[PDB]
Amino acid sequence: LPHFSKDDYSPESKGFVENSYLRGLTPQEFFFHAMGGREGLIDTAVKTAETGYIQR
Amino acid sequence: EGLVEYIDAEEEESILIAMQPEDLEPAEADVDPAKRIRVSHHATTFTHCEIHPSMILGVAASIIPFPDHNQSPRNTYQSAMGKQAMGVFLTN
Amino acid sequence: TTFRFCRDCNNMLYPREDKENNRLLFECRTCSYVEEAGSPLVYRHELITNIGETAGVVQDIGSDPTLPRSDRECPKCHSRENVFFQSQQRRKDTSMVLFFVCLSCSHIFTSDQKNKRTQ
Amino acid sequence: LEPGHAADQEQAKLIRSAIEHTTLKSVTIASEIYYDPDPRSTVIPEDEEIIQLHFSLQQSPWLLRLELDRAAMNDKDLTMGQVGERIKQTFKNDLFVIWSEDNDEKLIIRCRVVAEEDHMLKKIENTMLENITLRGVENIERVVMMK
Amino acid sequence: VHRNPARLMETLRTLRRKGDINPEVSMIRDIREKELKIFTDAGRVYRPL
Amino acid sequence: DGPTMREITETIAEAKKKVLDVTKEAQANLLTAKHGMTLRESFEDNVVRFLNEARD
Amino acid sequence: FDMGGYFIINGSEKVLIAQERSAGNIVQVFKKAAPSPISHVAEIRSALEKGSRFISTLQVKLYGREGSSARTIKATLPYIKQDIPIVIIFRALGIIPDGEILEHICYDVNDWQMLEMLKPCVEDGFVIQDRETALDFIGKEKRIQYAKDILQKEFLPHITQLEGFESRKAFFLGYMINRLLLCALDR
Amino acid sequence: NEAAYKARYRIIYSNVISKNNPDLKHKIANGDITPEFLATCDAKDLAPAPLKQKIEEIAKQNLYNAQGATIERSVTDRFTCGKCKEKKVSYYQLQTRSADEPLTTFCTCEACGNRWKFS
Ligand SMILES: [Zn+2]
Ligand SMILES: [Zn+2]
Ligand SMILES: [Zn+2]
């Protein structure tokens, strides 16, 4: 994120959410987390397309 | 009065940004055992700062309370239903 | 192979052989010019390539805020103002060493601990 | 593996290199075309000692020199002899070949043809990298060992 | 092209920050590649900082 | 339980250094490539494996 | 409380929806599938900001994958059925002397890698040697014209379609090729 | 045988020459034886040285380059197998179902090899 110094390989930047859902993510955490989840919601949009055909 | 600028995606590449205007500025000369855990301010190059993070959201989410306390996908659904709910779409 | 082009009709230079005198000659397939060989090396096809590089610092690499700072000390100037990065060789297998830079001299000093580089 | 031959660690690579398709192109480090007209001395220093050996115990003046990788000659076992030996029985009687010894700090392979020599000495530049096999089976690129 | 750009840059930036160059328009300095990217294009999403 | 929170915090931090260590130990070219192919590829597989190990 | 922003057509409140698309007039390089004669490519979508708005793409290819001999750099122009070696074009633009061409492609002579890369290329256009023929092999007398236009109104049409700017254009074609190779050379 | 022888012888021778020488020377012386032885062886090594070392050492790097990556994974002490009834299993969650049910979580007995879902 532009809120980071170039070539930073530390965990808090490659996407590691340290807080518990109880404390609550941070801007960065929150954002990555997203990218992360939103994934399934996709291989489900395409899987669904071919799945059906096989099934039949 | 040049105190804020309009930075796109491209011109965002070549800059640094502070999350909070405060916390991410002063010096380091204790910490709440309840709060979350934000990293640090290991840099003194900050070209710009974020007004408030919340603004990364869109209409939808903006309404969710504490979206920062739920599995990302939950908020993705809730932002597809507040559209199926009822209310006062105008007053006329 | 640092090849060359002629004069006057400035193009490409193709080699030909001096039978009688047994020697190497370059030439112009457009004009007429002909010049003597520079070396017997006419071609090289490097397959395996050993590349460990640094990025050409435009010298203003102290103004670009996107980079991190370090408090180490150069081998000569001994300043404490750096700004590292990595091998701009966008190759997978590349290593993960750091190339710092002095803002008060312009010296490229690694943190390596096996090989030794002056380039 | 075959019955017994199991935990025989080394026995492993011994076959790896007996399968994993290996091509000259995989072992080469360069290909160079030189102007050496004296088949009894190479305008190249580092090459001397070689030549001297192949004459104690017609052609063309156009040279083609191939330095090879040492490190790449063990991973998949191999010996200069073998290598060239193959190149030689590849074109046969119509292209002179030579080669340093497994002890030289620089392994190499010199050779000349035998009416446009350069042009034809490039068709044989490729025909030497992609249609030439050494040890292995075609199609099978990489191969590895597992416990 | 343009030689010493360090100044060519902070001259445009403050030229913008006054309102002489539309605050919309974007200009980027890719130092490590020696390039000056300036845009006017219609369709660039942009926030405010 | 209050302590089990701190006990976790540090259990996270400790897992950060166990990363940081492998960070410089790879910025100083002292990392065994590993059958894991690619030094970099071999770097991650260690970091990840270190943080996950921490969450669980 | 209504915030407008919409329309009102044949009664109903209609909305015009944000249409995202691939930006324009920019150079991008792409790697291509293992099973193909083309190695890498640099693309630029050219569309005049105001006026008819022509959308002709400029393709700068790169035959010969990684390894095979004769890695030639060719490019495609609108209304031209075949492809063309960046050279012919370059001479077609009024830049006959190679090495000068290489001055349009290489900005540092201490970069023998890239230089080397073009050798095989110049060798390709060697069958030409003057701006006359250059425009010729872009189809006598009749075809030699057709090309002049295309390279004005259709070639890298952004920037300008006018006339007296063969220099600014070339420099770009180069800026492309440069970029193009910078990738074939893992940089 | 033849030559063888031659070769052886030669070669050786050659060787021686070469260187060785011384040785050669021685031769011587021685024885023879040686040778023878050578033849055978071869021787060479033985033868060769002095190469022996290097040539012999070079083989090792090649052994190395022959082994197949080890998927390393954690084992949780509150997760159990259906056969090898042991608390050494790994997991990874994915979003199999729509945004109303969330997290499938697939298991793998890292020792006996059974896999399964939790919903
Ligand atoms: Zn000439
Ligand atoms: Zn210094
Ligand atoms: Zn199990």
> Which class does domain C1-45 fall in?
mainly beta
Helix (H) or strand (E) holding H60: helix H52-64
Alpha-carbon Rg for chain A in angstroms: 17
Residue range(s) of every CATH 2.20.25.10 domain in chain C: 1-45, 46-119
The residue with tokens 């290991």 is B42
Ordered DSSP codes for F9-50: HHHHHHHHHHHHHHHHTTTTT-----TT-SHHHHHHHHHHHH
Q: How far apart are CA H68 and CA C8, in angstroms?
A: 60
CB contact under 8 A, B4 and E49: yes
The closest alpha carbon to E41, from E21, E25, E17, E27, belongs to E25
Alpha-carbon Rg for chain E in angstroms: 12
Q: Which ligand is nearest to the CA of C107?
A: 2
Cβ atoms within 10 Å of C82's Cβ, excluding its own: 21
Q: Which architecture does CATH list for C46-119?
A: Single Sheet (2.20)
Cβ atoms within 10 Å of D99's Cβ, excluding its own: 23
Q: Which two tokens stand for residue G179?
A: 């970029």
Cβ atoms within 10 Å of A36's Cβ, excluding its own: 14
Cβ atoms within 10 Å of A12's Cβ, excluding its own: 19
Find the helix packing angle between B72-81 and A27-37, rounded to 10°.
80
The domain in which residue H61 lies consists of: 50-119
**D129 Cβ contact list (under 8 Å, min separation 6):** D23, D24, D25, D28, D31, G67
Q: How far apart are CA F32 and CA F46, in angstroms?
A: 11
Q: How far apart are CA H119 and CA H96, in angstroms?
A: 9
| B89 Cα to chain G: minimum distance (Å) | 9
**G71 Cβ contact list (under 8 Å, min separation 6):** G39, G62, G63, G64, G65, G117, G120, G184
> Are the C-beta atoms of residues B54 and B60 closer than 8 Å to each other?
no
> Are the C-beta atoms of residues G128 and G122 closer than 8 Å to each other?
no
Distance (Å) from CA C65 to ligand 2 centroid: 19
Nearest chain A alpha carbon to B14: A2
Beta partners for residue C10, in sequence order: none
Q: Which residues on chain B place their C-beta less than 8 Å from a C-beta of chain E?
A: 2, 4-11, 13-14, 17, 48-51, 55
The residue with tokens 């990218």 is A35
Q: Provide the greatest CA pair distance for chain D.
A: 59
> Are the C-beta atoms of residues D35 and D62 closer than 8 Å to each other?
yes
**Which CATH number does the domain housing residue H90 bear?**
2.20.25.10
CB contact under 8 A, F27 and C114: no
Q: What are phi and psi of D28, to 5 degrees?
A: -80, 160
CA D117 to chain CA centroid, nearest Å: 22
Q: Provide the greatest CA pair distance for chain H.
A: 88
Q: Is E13 helix (H, G, I), strand (E, B) or coil?
A: helix
The domain in which residue D36 lies consists of: 22-136
CB under 8 A, 24+ apart: contacts of A35-41: A36/B72, A37/B71, A37/B72, A37/B73, A37/B76, A37/H95, A38/B72, A38/B73, A38/B76, A39/H95, A40/B73, A40/H94, A40/H95, A40/H96, A41/B73, A41/B76, A41/H95, A41/H98, A41/H99
Task: Measure Cα distances from D21 to A1, A6, C113 in Å.
Answer: 45, 42, 36
- Report the first-to-last Cα separation within chain D, whole angstroms: 12
- Report the first-to-last Cα separation within chain H, whole angstroms: 72
Dump strand ranges (E) for G12-154: 27-31, 40-46, 56-60, 74-76, 84-85
Q: How far apart are CA G148 and CA G131, in angstroms?
A: 11
Task: Measure Cα distances from G157 to B74, C21, G25, G48, G54 in Å.
Answer: 49, 55, 10, 7, 8
The closest alpha carbon to H90, from D75, C25, C55, F53, belongs to F53
Amino acid at G32: K
The closest alpha carbon to D74, from H54, H40, H19, belongs to H54
> Are the C-beta atoms of residues G173 and G93 closer than 8 Å to each other?
yes
Residues with CB under 5 Å of ion ligand 3 are: H 81, 84, 86, 109, 111-112
Q: Is G182 helix (H, G, I), strand (E, B) or coil?
A: helix
10 Å CB burial of residue D111 (0-12, 13-18, 19+) is: buried
**Which CATH number does the domain housing residue D120 bear?**
3.30.1360.140
Helix locations, chain G, DSSP H: 86-92, 102-105, 112-125, 131-136, 143-149, 166-184
Resolution in A: 3.8
10 Å CB burial of residue F14 (0-12, 13-18, 19+) is: exposed
Q: Which residues of E touch C57 (CB under 8 A)?
A: 32
Amino acid at H55: I
Q: Is E28 helix (H, G, I), strand (E, B) or coil?
A: strand
Taking the CA atoms of residue B40, residue B41, residue B43 and residue B49 in that order, the dihedral angle to the nearest 10 degrees is: 130
Q: How far apart are CA G42 and CA G174, in angstroms?
A: 11
The closest alpha carbon to C93, from G181, H61, G34, F41, belongs to F41
Q: Which two tokens stand for residue H84?
A: 């090898």
- Counted residue by residue, chain H has a size of 119
Residues contributing to the annotated binding site of H for Zn(2+): 81, 84, 109, 112
Helix locations, G40-157, DSSP H: 86-92, 102-105, 112-125, 131-136, 143-149
Task: Measure Cα distances from G60 to D5, E43, G40, G108, G177 in Å.
Answer: 55, 26, 9, 21, 7
